[model samples]
Target: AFTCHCRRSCYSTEYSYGTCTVMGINHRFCCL
Candidate 1:
């Protein structure tokens, strides 16, 4: 499974950026 975390802009209600994480330590672009 994968999890995604996003950062929202303080000034506006738009999302600024996002980050992703996996169950294991190793990560791959293919999995994303």
Candidate 2:
């Protein structure tokens, strides 16, 4: 899985609220 420590910092949002959904899956909240 792709991961980044400062992903939330870059997006200016909390990790819990920040998320990314890929390949029709549910949103995954976090860098990893």
Candidate 3:
């Protein structure tokens, strides 16, 4: 998993929302 800015949970076909948190914001990581 990698950390990145995401909108609405997630927005990619190859990537899915992974359980994560950063700076107490909507930021999160992705899972493959």
Candidate 4:
């Protein structure tokens, strides 16, 4: 996307956080 996920353990209060142009088109929180 456009940003770094940090890791699965990395949790943010912002649901659909920020842009992820590096990883994908846009980035967000994903869970198992």
Candidate 5:
């Protein structure tokens, strides 16, 4: 789905920008 488009900033109207910790490394993420 569109969630796979997290390579860039998330769209405010659709998805919200967020962060997720993976292996102690925080990365940008998108969510409803």
Candidate 6:
């Protein structure tokens, strides 16, 4: 699911930028 990968990146201590697609939607997010 999108939640797993996206949330993992979100919890990272450094910059997180990647394309995480779930179902037919594209999720773009970066967290540091």
TM-score of 2: 0.25
Query: In model 2, what are the clashing residue pairs, if there are any?
Result: none
Question: What RMSD value applies to candidate 6?
Answer: 6.7
Could you give candidate 1's per-residue lDDT for residues 1-32 as a string of tens digits? 64333322222433333433356443322311
Name the lDDT of candidate 2: 0.46
On TM-score, the candidate that comes out on top is 5
All candidates' lDDT scores?
0.33, 0.46, 0.53, 0.43, 0.56, 0.53
User: Residue by residue across 1-32, what tens digits does model 4's lDDT show?
Assistant: 34445343335543444444535554444332
Point out where model 2 deviates above 4 Å.
Answer: 1-14
Q: Please provide TM-scores, in order, for all candidate models, with all chains considered together.
A: 0.19, 0.25, 0.27, 0.22, 0.36, 0.32
Candidate 6: list runs displaced more than 4 Å.
1-4, 7-14, 29-32
lDDT of 5 by residue, 1-32 (tens): 35533425656654646775556766557665
lDDT of 3 by residue, 1-32 (tens): 55454444666643656555555665545544
Worst 10 residues of 5 by lDDT: 1-10
For lDDT, the strongest prediction is 5
Give the winner by TM-score: 3 or 4: 3
Residues 1-32, candidate 6: write the lDDT tens digits.
13334443465554557866767677645544
Candidate closer to the true structure by lDDT (higher is better), 2 or 6: 6
Better of 1 and 2 by TM-score: 2
RMSD of each: 10.8, 8.0, 4.0, 8.1, 4.1, 6.7
Q: What is the lDDT of residue 31 in candidate 3?
A: 46
Model 1 spans with C-alpha error above 4 angstroms:
8-32
